[PDB]
Chain A
Amino acid sequence: MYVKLISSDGHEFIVKREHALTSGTIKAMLSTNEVNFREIPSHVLSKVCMYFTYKVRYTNSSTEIPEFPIAPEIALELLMAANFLDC
């Protein structure tokens, strides 16, 4: 049911398997239900996990969808992670 995504600084983020599989890249890494991200720090990976919860909730819902917030200080590294994980 859950998987563990570990940031470059050792923070362990635990999310549902279904959320984690929205990334094709993570699905590939998972086939321990753990994945180590040696280049994605904690302030990027936590935002990634927030996006999973946001994507799953607001895909197919028509209730008015809110902006996904990205602080300017986080955008460059979030872009690099999103680009690498294809999401």
Chain B
Amino acid sequence: MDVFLMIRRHKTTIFTDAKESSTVFELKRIVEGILKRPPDEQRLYKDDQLLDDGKTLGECGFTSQTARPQAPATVGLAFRADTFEALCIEPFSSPPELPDVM
């Protein structure tokens, strides 16, 4: 079963997919291939909750029903540089006022 994700840190957002059965660590390996940073220098969060390497995305509640392709689930990403930064995700820009018409 595919789960569809946005891995987000700062102004970075990775769109990828994975299996419910794959693990947080395996998700970190995917982050490694893209941002070129090792797993031990990554922390992954579901909201403010720190995710453990051995747990499957399904157990962390990334499921086919909530991580859909048109509506992906957010996974927070935090790096360490010998200390880990706090988890920070910069929000997307805000839409303009809805025009008188709509």
Chain A residues proximal to chain B, CB less than 8 Å: 1-2, 7-16, 19, 41-43, 46, 49-54, 56-58, 66, 68-69, 71-77
Known: A72-B102, A74-B95, A77-B95. A51 touches B70 (CB 8 A): yes
Residue A19 contacts which of B12, B15, B90 (CB distance < 8 angstroms)? B15
A73 to B97, CA, bound (A): 7
Residue A14 contacts which of B34, B69, B92, B99 (CB distance < 8 angstroms)? B34
Chain B residues proximal to chain A, CB less than 8 Å: 2, 4, 6, 11-17, 33-34, 68-72, 90, 92-96, 98-99, 102
- Contact: B93 with A41, CB < 8 Å? yes
- Contact: B13 with A73, CB < 8 Å? no
**Told that A8-B93, A14-B34 touch, could you supply 7 new A-B pairs with CB distance under 8 A?**
A43-B93, A46-B13, A49-B13, A53-B17, A71-B95, A76-B99, A77-B96
A residues near B34, Cβ cutoff 8 Å:
2, 14
- Contact: A11 with B98, CB < 8 Å? no
